[PDB]
Design a protein around this ligand. Structure first.
Ligand SMILES: CCN(CC)c1ccc2c(C)c(CCN3C(=O)N[C@@]4(CCN(C(=O)c5c[nH]cn5)C4)C3=O)c(=O)oc2c1
Lengths: 215, 215
């Protein structure tokens, strides 16, 4: 029985090299294979190293596994650091009576560039209106950092009720996405000339407007 | 190689028994050992079962591994459910050097009543069409537990490319919301008769369809 000790957290800027150590508490690091897993928030882990230093297909060659018997440790070295590398990393080995994991290392990539959101506003569908409901959705994607504020307008007037905005989550392009949705009656929707969603990100506001459409 | 297919989510109340299955797509489940890993949100993985049914020391006998050759499946059974059992559970096996992980099952220990999601599917906005974009958005609101899986269809064909789903977040009504969006070209969107959003939650799959037109 042994533990694998990892740093709690490491931070580095893009294009730099970072090293994550994994020290075996008891027994020799080289008595069993060390694996490394990467996990992005809200995703399942992916293997980036097995058998100490082997990369599965799809893993970039920027990921290098090594063993240092003299410090009884394994290391994951990431060269040419990219923002997609921001994640939790877990080392793992074998006891014969167990698969044991490190406590994990949070890798922060500093100085990721600002990215203004794409904002798309969807009016209620004919189908939804037929079911006596009216929802607007303001889709907000491709933004960094992951903080927006949203204000809604009925004509020019502030909407103060029926608004929800999801907590931004990092998507596969490593920029944030969220939706703000406004629940209306069909009568409220048809009573105004338009509704607007105003998304503020890092001091800049993007406004979209939709209106009831005749045929 | 093969896949290990787990249900996306399971739930129960404290003190109850829940089973998580793991079906091997090809080859015999008993040809190779099955392991089970627990990952509590914001924690490192831990092994709860190795070699089909062995418990590492420290793992309570509330956790039980089994093999069903009949269904070519493994199962984890957790009895006496406690709130600390809320976690993602992964099964894992191999054929020679190919290591295969299951997709993971979210186990929720119910803190509040179950709630089926409202699903609203939006066709592309006129404005975005004139920016050469045809994003579809599937809003998913008012659900508990906070675990959903979304699958998209172009006519009758599963879509893979261009799907993004946000991590479910708890809104002001203490229920979860998320959005799945499919980033289409206007030509992709018009080249099909319909697209469909399939949302799976707590033993049910709801479906919504949208189609092109002018109005
Ligand atoms: C919490 C438990 N846990 C331990 C960290 C997980 C959980 C799920 C996963 C999942 C889902 C994947 C992704 C899918 N996938 C596999 O099922 N197998 C590989 C392909 C081959 N591989 C190997 O490790 C491998 C192949 N020859 C030797 N080793 C990982 C893979 O990418 C993965 O790679 O690693 C996982 C690890």
């Amino acid at each position: 029985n042994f533990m694998l000790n990892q740093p709690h957290s490491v931070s580095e800027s893009p294009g730099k090299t970072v090293t994550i150590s994994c020290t075996r508490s008891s027994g020799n690091i080289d008595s069993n294979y060390v694996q490394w897993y990467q996990q992005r928030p809200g995703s399942a882990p992916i293997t980036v190293i097995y058998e100490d230093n082997q990369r599965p297909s799809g893993v970039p060659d920027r990921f290098a596994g090594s063993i240092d018997r003299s410090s009884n440790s394994a290391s994951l070295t990431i060269s040419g650091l990219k923002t997609e590398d921001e994640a939790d990393y877990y080392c793992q080995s074998y006891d014969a009576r167990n698969v044991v994991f490190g406590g994990g290392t949070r890798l922060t990539v500093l100085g990721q560039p600002k990215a203004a959101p794409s904002v798309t506003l969807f009016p209620p569908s004919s189908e939804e209106l037929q079911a006596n409901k009216a929802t607007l959705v303001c889709l907000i994607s491709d933004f960094y950092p992951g903080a927006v504020t949203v204000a809604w307008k009925a004509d020019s007037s502030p909407v103060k009720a029926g608004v929800e905005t999801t907590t931004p989550s990092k998507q596969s392009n490593n920029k944030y996405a969220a939706s703000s949705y406004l629940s209306l009656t069909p009568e409220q929707w048809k009573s105004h000339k338009s509704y607007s969603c105003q998304v503020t990100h890092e001091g800049s506001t993007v406004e979209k407007t939709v209106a009831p459409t005749e045929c």
